[PDB]
């Protein structure tokens, strides 16, 4: 009988926009960046 509370919290939260550009690498170049960060400087 108390089904008027549905979707209460999702409608309560204040809204915040996404951030802008910060484009990411893809593919073989992204595997290169990870390899440097985990092993190249750790030695």
């Amino acid at each position: 009988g108390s089904l008027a509370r549905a979707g209460k919290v999702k409608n309560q939260t204040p809204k915040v926009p996404k951030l802008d550009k910060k484009k990411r690498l893809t593919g073989r170049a992204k595997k290169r960046q990870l390899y440097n960060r985990r092993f190249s400087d750790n030695g």
């Binding site: 593919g27 073989r28 170049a29 595997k31 290169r32 990870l34 390899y35 440097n36 985990r38 092993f39």
Partner: protein, 185 residues
């Protein structure tokens, strides 16, 4: 009717998705040889497993048996021709000792890097994909090409490449044009 051309798979999944040590080893190899995904590691593992299975079955078999003689000679010849065994270790026991780096060392990418001719392994991959490389008067643009023994002294630039004695590319000619209409205006 259905077509009579068949097909097959070339890779296989690890069966244990979040094991730390295997994951670190895979990243080791990917970074060392400049690869794209885990799928290439898994295809090489698949191929090596087939080779090792054949070798094991042959080894459990009787000596001076015709099957062993025929198939073992064929397999050893194939391996030495591929450049994986050598000259003094052709005995069907050194097949079981082949490791992942050995096979991974024969790629055209690694070979193009190791023979000077490129400043890195990523440079080596980008050059192959941009139609700059030949293997014996045939132009190859696939970085997983496996180089056989008698083909590794014939790697060189292509005749239709600006790095191999031809006209310059689309950028050089446009800069030279702009310079010309600058100097003749």
């Amino acid at each position: 009717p259905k077509s009579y051309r068949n097909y097959s798979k070339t890779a296989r999944n690890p069966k244990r998705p979040f094991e730390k040590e295997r994951l670190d080893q895979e990243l080791k190899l990917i970074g060392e040889y400049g690869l794209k995904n885990k799928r290439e590691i898994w295809r090489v593992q698949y191929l090596l497993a087939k080779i090792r299975s054949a070798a094991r079955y042959l080894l459990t078999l009787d000596e001076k048996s015709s099957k062993r003689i025929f198939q073992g000679e064929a397999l050893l010849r194939r391996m030495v021709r591929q450049g994986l065994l050598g000259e003094n270790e052709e005995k069907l026991d050194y097949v079981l000792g082949l490791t992942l780096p050995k096979l991974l060392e024969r790629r055209l990418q690694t070979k193009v890097f190791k023979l000077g001719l490129a400043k890195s392994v990523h440079h080596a991959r980008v050059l192959i994909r941009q139609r700059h490389i030949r293997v014996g008067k045939q132009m190859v643009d696939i970085p997983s090409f496996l180089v056989r023994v008698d083909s590794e002294k014939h790697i060189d630039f292509a005749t239709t490449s600006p790095f191999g004695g031809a006209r310059p590319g689309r950028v050089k000619r446009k800069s030279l044009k702009k310079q010309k209409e600058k100097t003749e205006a």
